[PDB]
Design a protein. Structure first.
Lengths: 254, 254, 254
């Protein structure tokens, strides 16, 4: 099912070691074996349905394109990147049907690596479609992070969208860069919302831990006061950190 | 007087009852009564000079336009929207002759409702003018808020400026949408100025309440210090709320 | 050498006073003497290498152009402005070879005045080059401030870049005005970086001056606690100041 895949792992390890010796056709052999094996993983993983195989098959196909560039075959690298897109988009199908956010995050990281590699390879049309699929995954993290409400997927999706925009700036697509930056701003703004909501909580904590304890000048009361005072400063510092990332997200629209 | 208002309220009901019944000529008649009744309420209010009747006549004329749609009479709804602007502008005049900013605020809220209704109606030219008279009112709230110096009229005028922008986008008008967003950033910035100037005050309060009282570790001195520390934290929260509104006002330029 | 400067200072003063008398040719002569004397101050300063003589000769040539406009010779003013550019750009070469930031700042101010003067003069070509050289000086204050890390050369360069943008708007170059405003946002963001980092310092100070002294409620301990609490509020106000400058710097892109 999936242990026959370890042939692709070993054939890639042999490709880089036969490069240093000076054998061009024996190094292209270990690269071509990986390309044909990774091709079969596209259909072997469709039977097993495992997301991990599609991930590791995509990571191998990206490193094959990175090797095929140093070998001198921009056509082996073109196919290797085109085969990475087919694998990433299949994770996009399995991550919508399984609804897992973890796969959506690692699949978005793959689509970013596919885009950066495809320009050093020489296939910008597939790279633009790699950035388009990357924003599609980040926009699906938007939909799920606003449903689960987790302040961790909002942060990760905001980090990914800014990498998608920086990639799209390396691409030559300011349309995708400005789409990705806007997506980053809509996320980091709702991070400011939930972070300011936490300041509204600690404020009223620093109002009931006081207006009842302003009459009692106890030693333990005053120290309890000093404990809530700094636990409010600890949280207002983070909003000044989150608001700074908005001013950095807003500035990358320039 | 007061009864011709409830007469219009009953005829609007009869218009909606006769639509479920099926009578088209009698639903049009009940709408026709409403427009002629609301017209008389305009004439009567222009002679009594009451801001209440002008507001209750505008809110009737708006809902007459909403009913004149479902009846299938966009001409009756065009006139209904036109008559709402005639009433909103007559609130602009009595707000300058009575110097009341509360009439201005309630007149701008009406000018916004007229704009949203006039597209569902189908008279965008009167809707664009409803948005234009809505910015004329926000910009009068600028003048008077910069005269009375209230940090609340600036907030309402800024919220109105944003709502004028969101309407102007539903309108189409990207000129008014950008006018209303540049007017919004004008206000939300001067809110940060008047709010940071209040931090500079309480900072120097937390510096004279210490440099003298760092030597005296009294029970009343230390409790005095803890009272100014949180009254400063109460104020820095407001700047992190106003600066957050700036970042939302700036993000709507994208 | 440097005593011929005071001769030019008297000849410039003789021009405006002979304008009040009514002598047009003797006012043109006093301007012609100044332009020839300042020219000699340029040739002498290029051999002595003194930065102060290049500055004083530039400030004279600028006021020579200001007087040459009142007298009525826009050709003497075109030369006086071009000669000011020759002096500032030579300070740009000496300030890169000596690395002094004090010269870079005053030379950027000189270039700003050269631009504002040349439009009253009538040579917009030289004025636009005066603003280009101003941004070059400001962007060289970027390179030196990001090496020494001084949070104050970042402040001065940010104010210069904003003045260059104000000039460029008076120029008619929104290209430069947007270049200068993006240069300002680059600086005020790194001011936020090094100000939030100073806030990460005092956070962990308000954690180690507490979580060990939470158990020890001494009169000297709690006063030392209050000292660090306000020294944190001292710094978090400076971030809300700087972050407000980022929101004003970003709003100028509208």
């Amino acid at each position: 099912t999936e242990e026959k895949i370890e042939e692709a792992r070993q054939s890639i390890k042999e490709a880089e070691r036969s490069l240093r010796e000076g054998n061009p056709e024996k190094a292209l052999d270990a690269v071509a074996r990986a390309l044909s094996l990774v091709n079969e993983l596209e259909r072997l993983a469709r039977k097993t349905g495992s997301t991990e195989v599609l991930i590791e098959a995509a990571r191998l196909a990206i490193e094959v394109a990175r090797v095929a560039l140093k070998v001198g075959s921009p056509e082996m690298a073109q196919l290797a990147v085109e085969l990475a897109l087919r694998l990433v988009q299949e994770l996009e199908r399995q991550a919508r049907k399984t609804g897992s956010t973890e796969v959506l995050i690692e699949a978005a990281r793959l689509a970013i690596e596919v885009a950066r590699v495809a320009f050093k390879v020489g296939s910008p049309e597939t790279a633009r479609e790699a950035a388009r699929t990357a924003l599609e995954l980040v926009e699906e993290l938007e939909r799920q992070a606003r449903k689960t409400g987790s302040e961790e997927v909002l942060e990760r999706a905001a980090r990914l969208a800014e990498e998608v925009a920086r990639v799209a700036e390396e691409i030559g697509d300011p349309e995708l860069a400005r789409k990705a930056m806007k997506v980053a701003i809509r996320l980091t703004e709702e991070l400011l919302k939930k972070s300011l909501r936490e300041l509204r909580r600690i404020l009223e904590e620093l109002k009931e831990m006081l207006e009842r304890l302003e009459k009692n000048p106890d030693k333990d009361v005053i120290v309890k006061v000093l404990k809530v005072i700094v636990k409010a400063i600890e949280a207002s510092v983070e909003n000044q950190r989150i608001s700074a990332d908005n001013q950095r997200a807003l500035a990358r629209l320039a």
